[PDB]
């Protein structure tokens, strides 16, 4: 039979994939790391409390400008904070309530939104009105949508709960190209700062890369050993982390097709939901279901320090494109600033 | 399915020719990223609270 | 600019007043998670109270909205955790087909057992009992094939069957609840509780049982609030 | 990389004795709930066994209760189910499956599509 | 002496516990945000205040006054008696808002969540401390309890102020947990009736004992604590069988002891625990 002969033949990819892995595994990067002087204790605060939210929080996005924010509750609204006054300067009431992603686009002109309703709903911040009103419904995805961002104004990359990615063009309203290849749920994506590719984590417990223009998987990373709940890249561009339910991070790096870093503590037993790098890439920011974040030294793999302001989940977390804050929202309604 | 074994196939063919790096190398680049921008990071370097939005 | 920063205070104004002003509505609503296999009786169920996402209903000035999720795919893994806050969730359970129980008990015992869900109570409808009775009057299907414990089962003595309700049909019908309420009883821990309830296709009262249920959810968990129960 | 890989079973006379055997690559086999689901001809998915992270717990289904016994060992990262006194019907293939998350009693692999933490499957089959 | 150095200890750890609890419980909702929300904590809070009031305005003169043997603030006494009557009406009658907020919640669940909007709590409270200031105030400075300042209180007054301020809040604290004791023994009859049958399935009262413990806690602390001191406030003015000055400081220190005690009882919700915990 054909299939018991592509079945082997994979095997066998596989194997070799492994060997060619295990050969370039010389060393690990805390023997080189080892001589590096610590970063010292982290000890941030909570700066800025921003309440208002009626339920649980899944997204947040801050934009070039460093001072907005979006963010989504189970209350069917999507709230524009304005981070340095804790102003609001947006409500916007969604028609489908169980949102889980927002993106705020690199010129400001935009906001996303999307969910169980199967529907990625753009709007438009800049209104000739003043009243902020939905631009464009993009619909084609079987699977509930886990995350997405914007490339440019015309160009939005989604991903869906029918283990599916959609490079979208928005004003025609259909798919300009269709990733596909993940067996279970892909959950987060996020967009290389040239933003030539982008990789997403599933719930296979695996990573992938793609290239926007042409829909190809260039490379995927394993791992894992449950579900990929979160996903970045480092601020070079060339290494990405990941968060799983395993209760650690993992950071990979692109050209090495291996896995450099493992952050894990052995009184963490619960899940990783969001995780983003600073502006430097020193410090790694992941929220725990333990109601608490933790921020990695992603260098020395050693804990920094932790962020335990929220009595709840933390499900959403964000830094600047300056560097300056950290956003995180949990599942208690609240957003809370750390600097 | 055979339609999805095939399409493995080719995937994981296509794949393996991928040419990758030490991990010195990698770990090289890491040091100097991190070294070159760590005067820049606001959350390393704590900054003056005068130069900080969010004090007052 | 200080003009500017005024406007944005009355703009933040009119964003808190109508954010209250939904909050209200949100307060006085109730959600629903209206879950089970396919072919249980979910569509009647939501048709009786009048295959969609959502539904809409009122009992005694209550508003109450039922989410039926037909749309993502058949796991359930991550699409249910965001149903953590709803009011209760409508476990619908076909008891006319033993084949397909198993896999009944095991969602029921995993949405019970869930990190996520463990305050999230469960009210179970065990729809099509006529189409049961047919089966049972038969003798055809044994319950004894499917499951061995019914052969020594005995019917509890707080039953309540219809007039001239064969005991047979008692007799199975509260085995079936007995199973789901040993699943339920196993980790209840006085968070959440399981609400049995015995219905037809036919039957016109649901809208009603799922209000008393809702009623001793909350009187549960403000009597749980108070550390009197 | 997670690797569920099951072994054994195969054409048998009614009344035998088989021994299925999963092996378990890549992750904490102690930490993870486990259990075996067999997918009949004609027909979808359906749970058979289970065992827990220490072994306290066991269950089987009503149909296969009494007849089939499975056995964890956390230290040979090996999972074994056994099974005698095979009926007509009970001719399957089978799946070692793990359940999602670990340090949880919660499993919803019984889907019938798609499972990232299932085996290729090993076919068993009775028959005079 | 002994005695005197004995009973100073006394009163000053009495005081300073009342301070302690209630300023914690003050800080627990000046800190955090999240337990102010609720609306039964508008209650919690308000009975917190009052009686936060009453250790700090009435305890320490009353205490001096002890101490020394004679009152030594002169004419401020009067002002002070106006600043008892006022700061523990308003602990008693808080605690049976409380009450019978409780009731509602367990009694009518979706009215409660739909009428019970921030301004009903408002208004109750408003109503409460209405009262407590208009039942002191007003009769104190027109001099109608007066029948060192020791005054015995006149007949009209003592048994106008007692019923009221008493025995209203105490008769619907009892009609609340009667009713409330009524509605718990239902549920956990079913509750029972489904967990004995699943027993029963599986082989094929201590909930009660629970439920009267909290209650019986509850309504007793507050009854021994208040009880006796009204009692005797009834009957000491219409006949002066009777009893002596020392049996009544100590009956009205067991009334003003009941507000250090309210910190424990009321305000040791979940929420409380976690917040006390990390202050
Ligand atoms: C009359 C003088 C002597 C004392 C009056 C103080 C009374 C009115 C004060 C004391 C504490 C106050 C409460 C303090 C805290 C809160 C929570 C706030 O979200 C609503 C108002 C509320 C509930 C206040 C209501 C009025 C209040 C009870
Ligand atoms: O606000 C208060 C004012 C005064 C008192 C006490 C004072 N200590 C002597 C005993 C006494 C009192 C009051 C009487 O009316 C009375 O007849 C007697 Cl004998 C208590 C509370
Ligand atoms: O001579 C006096 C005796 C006693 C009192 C106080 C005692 N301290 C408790 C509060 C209280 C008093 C009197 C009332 O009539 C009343 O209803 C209350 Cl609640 C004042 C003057």
Redesign the pocket.
Known sequence: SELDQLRQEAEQLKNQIRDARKACADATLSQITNNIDPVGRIQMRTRRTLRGHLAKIYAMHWGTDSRLLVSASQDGKLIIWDSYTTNKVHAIPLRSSWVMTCAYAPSGNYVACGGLDNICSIYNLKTREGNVRVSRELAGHTGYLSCCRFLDDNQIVTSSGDTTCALWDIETGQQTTTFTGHTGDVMSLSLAPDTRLFVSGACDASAKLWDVREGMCRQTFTGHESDINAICFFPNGNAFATGSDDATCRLFDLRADQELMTYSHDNIICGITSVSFSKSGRLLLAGYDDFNCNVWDALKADRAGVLAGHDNRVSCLGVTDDGMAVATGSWDSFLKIWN | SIAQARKLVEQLKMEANIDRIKVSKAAADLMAYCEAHAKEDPLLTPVPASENPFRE | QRNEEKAQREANKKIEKQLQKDKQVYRATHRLLLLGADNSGKSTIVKQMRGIFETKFQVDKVNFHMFDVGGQRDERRKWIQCFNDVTAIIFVVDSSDYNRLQEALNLFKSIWNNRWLRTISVILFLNKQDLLAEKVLAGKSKIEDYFPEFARYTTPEDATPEPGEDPRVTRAKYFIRDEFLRISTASGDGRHYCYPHFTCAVDTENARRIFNDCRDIIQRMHLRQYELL | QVQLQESGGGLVQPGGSLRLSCAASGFTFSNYKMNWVRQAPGKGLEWVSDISQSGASISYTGSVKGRFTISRDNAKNTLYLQMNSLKPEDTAVYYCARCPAPFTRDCFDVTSTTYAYRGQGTQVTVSS | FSVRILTACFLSLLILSTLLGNTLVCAAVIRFRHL?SKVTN?FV??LA?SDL?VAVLVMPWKAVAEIAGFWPFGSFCNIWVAFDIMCSTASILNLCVISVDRYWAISSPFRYERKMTPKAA?IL?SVA?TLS?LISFIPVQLSWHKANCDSSLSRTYAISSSVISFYIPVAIMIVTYTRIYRIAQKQIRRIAALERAAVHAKNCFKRETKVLKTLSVIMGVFVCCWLPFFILNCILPFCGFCIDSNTFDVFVWFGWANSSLNPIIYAFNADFRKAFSTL
């Open positions: 102010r508008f809070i308000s205040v009031l408002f409270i401390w200031v």
